[PDB]
Amino acid sequence: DNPPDPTPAKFFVPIPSHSWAHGTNTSEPTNTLRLDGGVVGVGRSDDIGTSDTAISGIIGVYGLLKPFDWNANDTGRNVGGHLLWSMPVHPQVDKDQVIQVMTQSKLTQYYLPPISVVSSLYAYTRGSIKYKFLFGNNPRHNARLLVAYIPGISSDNRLTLERARNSAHVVFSLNEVSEFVFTVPYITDTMWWPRKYGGPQAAGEFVAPSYICMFILNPLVAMESVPSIVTIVPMIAAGDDFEVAVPAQPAVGLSRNIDVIYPKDSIISFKSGYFPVYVGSWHSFFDSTKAILRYGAVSDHIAQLGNIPANVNRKAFWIVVGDTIKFKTLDKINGTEWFIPEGEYTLGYGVVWRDGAYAYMVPYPLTPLGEKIAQYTASLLASNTAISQIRPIPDYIVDSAASKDNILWSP
Amino acid sequence: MDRPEGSEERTVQTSNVVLGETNIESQDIASKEYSPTWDRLASSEVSDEYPMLTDRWLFWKSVKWEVNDSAFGKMLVQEKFPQSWVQMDVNIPNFIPFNIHQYMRADFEVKIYVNPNDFVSG
Amino acid sequence: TPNVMQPTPLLPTTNDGRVTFGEAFNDLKDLARRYQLYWEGTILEGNLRAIRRNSALVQLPLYPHGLRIQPDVNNPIWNIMRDGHIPVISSGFRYFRGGLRLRIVVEGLNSCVWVQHHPDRPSIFSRPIIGRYIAAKDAYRNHAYAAYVQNMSVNRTIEVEVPFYQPGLYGMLNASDNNTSFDRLRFTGLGDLLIGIEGEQPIPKEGIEISVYYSIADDFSFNIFCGFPPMVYCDETYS
Amino acid sequence: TPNVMQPTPLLPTTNDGRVTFGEAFNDLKDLARRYQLYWEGTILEGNLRAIRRNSALVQLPLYPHGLRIQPDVNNPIWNIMRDGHIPVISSGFRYFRGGLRLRIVVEGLNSCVWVQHHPDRPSIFSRPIIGRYIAAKDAYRNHAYAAYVQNMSVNRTIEVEVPFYQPGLYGMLNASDNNTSFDRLRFTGLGDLLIGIEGEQPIPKEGIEISVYYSIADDFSFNIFCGFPPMVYCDETYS
């Protein structure tokens, strides 16, 4: 009995994959690489806690902001009404109010607080913010500060003590007190507030909704047998009513690798798929006696360069700006004392050799002598010199070790 | 202070040792405190506990920081925890509750004592 | 002074009206992410060994904290804006115990592709290695390992779930790279993933492009909260 | 004198017999439309940047009232007859709060295509921009944004639903174009949609054609009724 099934076909729409956006409240079908083909999840115990990824838990942790000294001997700055400290009020912290570590030709590193890092993962945000002020004083020190929350302001262009008292503020006393918190409100024309810093998409940073300012009410007074300087350490945390709206492009990145390729005319690291590279020979290039960068032992496999920008000088040569390789390589040239002793050198310079639509690279040792030889070679190619006259270019002795990955260059 | 004696000072007593404190602490816990259950799943040999020795509070180091070397970020002590191995040459010494055994595990508690004057800040 | 400690609060106002994280918007916002982000680039013929049979093309180390970022001019998604959400989320924690979901896209081929998972293989690399330049005895397909064979004629995106097979209490994320221990090679990564092509037939002239996207799983957990390492703003990637 | 006000009626007859809007015909006629209408044209190789990797080909601003109509001779569907129903329906209202459904068709390619959504991106453009001529730092794929990766070998029409993520009470439709406020860039559009190609491989000689159709959603609503702006008859497009 092989009964027929004339049951109408169903219109179905084929798709390549399941949702890439969905992260919760749904099922994600997949090919589990296990021996058990059922609903399977890692075994746990009390040694291995639940995921600690509650947003309210994390952003409640206090982060440290740029400290500042509070001198009592300063007869000018320590007066009634002076502005000691101020900054815009938002989840992320103003870059100038954060501990920074700069580096030459690298990226600036910011020690962001828990509330700021998380907020940089979401588009909008709202809620009260908790600013804890820690004072490095002893019982002898005494003062009073008036910290205010000015809504709708983002600078201190028109900001004074006698104006800050006209908004949400608090008056703290520094009389045997070393710690206190000023939980600032969330006063906004709207419900959620966009992040001040964000993913590269426009040329403008959004603005914070308010401004926090610390003023002097009764100037700090110390004594002769006590430090006149009292360092103040502002710390930030999110209020119990703090919330983050929508996931967006991180306005932050990891400081594991601070290497970057700015708009600085880096010379493009060949092409993708044409690396790793090594120094080799080419039968169409001076009967494979000279050196070029290959990407494969197979014939007709010379490393091609990517799109060289048209704003680069034709007489210019290049320099390695990243990880490089070592290679062994030329006799003395007529009229000059240019001669390269046989040995192993680190790749540093290079000259572009164009052959139609494809562009290749010619290696040069990282030596004061090699820079000048590549200098001339770059000039000879600019004047369309005979191929046979430019020949006296490093020699090919043997192959060299392959690079970890793509090698960068610069004019 | 206000008595023929000093002020009344709080006490903390463990096995064979007593610690004295005079003021209010500042505390916190590394992670959620618990009871190990997968450790018996790692060794077939019976585990051993030495409360009289392991519960003891020990003093291991005392560092001095002066004004001239006191800068924001200055690391006063940076060591791998837990490593409290002290011997005549750079060489775990059997002179204290320390055991020369292959494996071990325990929860730790660190107390920091500092004794400044009424007229300093930091 | 616990990580959350307010000694003396001076709160001038009442709290803001409570929303649920999904009310003025319609999704519940908590720190869980099955959003898929990229992991690698493209491959050409000149990259593969002379005998490309049962020889994998890619050796992918499995790290919840992603791979070690490497900026290129051919790939601006790493250079102008840093790595995705996942590695910045894992940067504030110490341990993990779950598996990872991998979505893999192979575009320049219409021939069958394989993907294998090696749990016990020591994860001592922070970057994927391709073809000839792969260490020998690696990128050789094994017999009794979790795998999935897929034809590109039917579907050119592979979705698999890599399990958690570590002989330990936790899984360590944010592992250092170059010089050891016994916790950095067998307790950090889920292992290695090998991607190869069923045939030994040469790669098309245009070459093949492999984009690996990944996400977290359900049995996954960020166990211990650590301090956040200093970050870098993507907005300042032009000066 | 409310908008509907009859001071003194002189009705000579009884009313016409009531039909339901679906009786002498079989559908219920009310003002709700999930009818899909076009949004853009085709792209060639010479339009894309020198390094077309993780670089989107199209920057689509999301407007319920459609894009700013631009007549061409290559495209008569805009020239002989004006834009579809949707932008003429939204012309009689002021605010919206829902998401939009997008159906996208890519015909000259058999390689993978991506689509990403940027809610918080300010919608300050009234026309889509392509390749090289796109503003820099735009048409760069982001990491943690709602997206959908699809292979054209399986299906060459992408259907996605763009959500409503605005930090406000309403969403403004019929927004002016050229010179601002804070309501025209973050409260008008749902954001921008980026369409790119997974590979950096060159575009076929014939080029690729992208037709984007869209419709309204269920959580969508035309909140406040405004007067109708003067219309143009399509029937008089020849004299």
Q: Where are the domains of chain D?
A: 1-239
List chains touching B (3+ CB pairs under 8 A).
Answer: A, C
Given a contact cutoff of 8 angstroms between Cβ atoms, the answer to whether D33 and D26 are in contact is: no
Q: What are the E-state strand segments in chain D?
A: 42-43, 56-62, 95-96, 100-106, 113-118, 129-130, 147-150, 157-162, 171-172, 191-197, 208-215
Among candidates A190, A202, A246 on the partner chain, residue whose Cβ is nearest the Cβ of D122: A202
Question: Nearest 5 degrees, angle CA D44-CA D47-CA D51?
Answer: 115
- In angstroms, rounded to a whole number, what is the distance separating the alpha carbons of residues C32 and D172? 32
Chain D residues whose C-beta is within 8 A of a chain C C-beta are: 51, 53-55, 111-112, 137, 140-144, 147, 149, 151, 153-154, 163, 165, 198-201, 219
Experimental resolution (Å): 3.4
Is D164 at the interface with chain A, CB within 8 A? no
Closest-CA distance of chain A to residue C57, Å: 12
Q: What are the E-state strand segments in D34-99?
A: 42-43, 56-62, 95-96
Given a contact cutoff of 8 angstroms between Cβ atoms, the answer to whether C198 and C111 are in contact is: yes
- In angstroms, rounded to a whole number, what is the distance separating the alpha carbons of residues C63 and B82? 27
Find the closest chain C residue to B38 by CA distance. C169
Is A194 at the interface with chain C, CB within 8 A? no
Set of chain C residues whose Cβ sits within 8 Å of the Cβ of D199: 42, 107-108, 209
For C195, the token pair is 């991607």
| Residue A53: how many other CB atoms lie within 10 Å | 20
Given a contact cutoff of 8 angstroms between Cβ atoms, the answer to whether C128 and C61 are in contact is: yes
Closest-CA distance of chain A to residue B98, Å: 25
**Does residue D71 have a cis peptide bond before it, meaning omega lies within 30 degrees of 0?**
no
Is D186 at the interface with chain A, CB within 8 A? yes
Q: Which of B28, B103, B105 to mutate to test the interface with C (most CBs of C within 10 A)?
A: B28
The residue from A246, A262, A278 where one domain ends is A262
Given a contact cutoff of 8 angstroms between Cβ atoms, the answer to whether C41 and C74 are in contact is: yes
Is C212 at the interface with chain A, CB within 8 A? no
For A289, the token pair is 């006696």
Given a contact cutoff of 8 angstroms between Cβ atoms, the answer to whether D202 and D114 are in contact is: no
Tokens 């999704």, located at residue: C27
Find the closest chain D residue to A195 by CA distance. D120
Closest-CA distance of chain A to residue D97, Å: 15
Domain total of chain A: 2
Are there at least 3 beta-carbon pairs closer than 8 Å between B and A? yes
Is A21 at the interface with chain C, CB within 8 A? yes
Is A200 at the interface with chain D, CB within 8 A? yes
The residue from A215, A246, A262 where one domain ends is A262
Set of chain D residues whose Cβ sits within 8 Å of the Cβ of C155: 151, 153-154
What A308-313 contacts at long range (C-beta under 8 Å, 24+ apart), as own/partner pairs, is A308/A267, A308/A268, A308/A352, A308/A359, A309/A265, A309/D50, A311/A265, A312/A265, A312/A267, A312/A411, A313/A411
- In angstroms, rounded to a whole number, what is the distance separating the alpha carbons of residues B84 and A345? 48
Q: A391 and A328: one domain?
A: yes
Radius of gyration of chain C (CA): 21
Q: Is A45 left (phi over 0), alpha (psi -120 to 50) or beta?
A: beta
Domain that includes residue A63, residue range: 1-262
| Residue C217: how many other CB atoms lie within 10 Å | 21
Burial of D25 (0-12, 13-18, 19+ CB in 10 A): exposed
For C149, the token pair is 């064979």
Can you count the helices (H) and strands (E) in chain B? 1, 2
Are there at least 3 beta-carbon pairs closer than 8 Å between B and D? no
| Residue A218: how many other CB atoms lie within 10 Å | 15
- In angstroms, rounded to a whole number, what is the distance separating the alpha carbons of residues A206 and A193? 10
Set of chain C residues whose Cβ sits within 8 Å of the Cβ of B110: none
Among candidates C31, C68, C169 on the partner chain, residue whose Cβ is nearest the Cβ of A47: C169
Neighbouring residues of A84: CB distance < 8 A, sequence distance ≥ 6: A68, A70, A77, A145, A214, A215, A216, A232
Is A341 at the interface with chain B, CB within 8 A? no
Q: What is the end-to-end Cα distance of chain A in Å, rounded? A: 81
- Taking CB atoms and an 8 Å limit, are A136 and B122 in contact across chains? yes
Q: What is the dihedral of CA D155, D157, D158, D161, to 10 degrees?
A: -130
Q: What is the end-to-end Cα distance of chain C in Å, rounded? A: 40
Sheet of C113-118: strands edge to edge?
C129-130, C56-62, C191-197, C113-118, C147-150
- In angstroms, rounded to a whole number, what is the distance separating the alpha carbons of residues A189 and D184? 16
- In angstroms, rounded to a whole number, what is the distance separating the alpha carbons of residues C67 and D62? 34
Closest-CA distance of chain D to residue C183, Å: 30
As for chain C, the residues directly before each break of C–N over 2.5 Å are 180
Is A274 at the interface with chain C, CB within 8 A? yes
- In angstroms, rounded to a whole number, what is the distance separating the alpha carbons of residues D35 and D94? 21
Q: For residue B3, what is the enclosing H or E element?
A: none
How long is chain D?
239
For D75, the token pair is 């495209």
For D219, the token pair is 């959580």
Set of chain C residues whose Cβ sits within 8 Å of the Cβ of D190: none
Can you count the helices (H) and strands (E) in chain D? 2, 11
Neighbouring residues of D230: CB distance < 8 A, sequence distance ≥ 6: none
Among candidates C2, C169, C225 on the partner chain, residue whose Cβ is nearest the Cβ of B38: C169
Is C142 at the interface with chain A, CB within 8 A? no
Neighbouring residues of A379: CB distance < 8 A, sequence distance ≥ 6: A315
Is A64 at the interface with chain B, CB within 8 A? no
Among candidates B36, B72, B119 on the partner chain, residue whose Cβ is nearest the Cβ of A47: B36
Radius of gyration of chain A (CA): 33
Q: What is the end-to-end Cα distance of chain B in Å, rounded? A: 24
3-class SS of residue C61:
strand
- In angstroms, rounded to a whole number, what is the distance separating the alpha carbons of residues A264 and A408? 12
Given a contact cutoff of 8 angstroms between Cβ atoms, the answer to whether B39 and B47 are in contact is: yes
Closest-CA distance of chain C to residue A332, Å: 35
Set of chain A residues whose Cβ sits within 8 Å of the Cβ of C15: 128, 239-241
D60 - beta bridge partners? D193
- Taking CB atoms and an 8 Å limit, are D146 and A21 in contact across chains? yes
Tokens 């000839």, located at residue: C132
Closest-CA distance of chain D to residue C182, Å: 33
Closest-CA distance of chain B to residue C91, Å: 17
Find the closest chain A residue to B67 by CA distance. A227
Find the closest chain C residue to A307 by CA distance. C74
- Taking CB atoms and an 8 Å limit, are A227 and B120 in contact across chains? yes
Amino acid, res. D40: E
- In angstroms, rounded to a whole number, what is the distance separating the alpha carbons of residues A320 and A318? 7
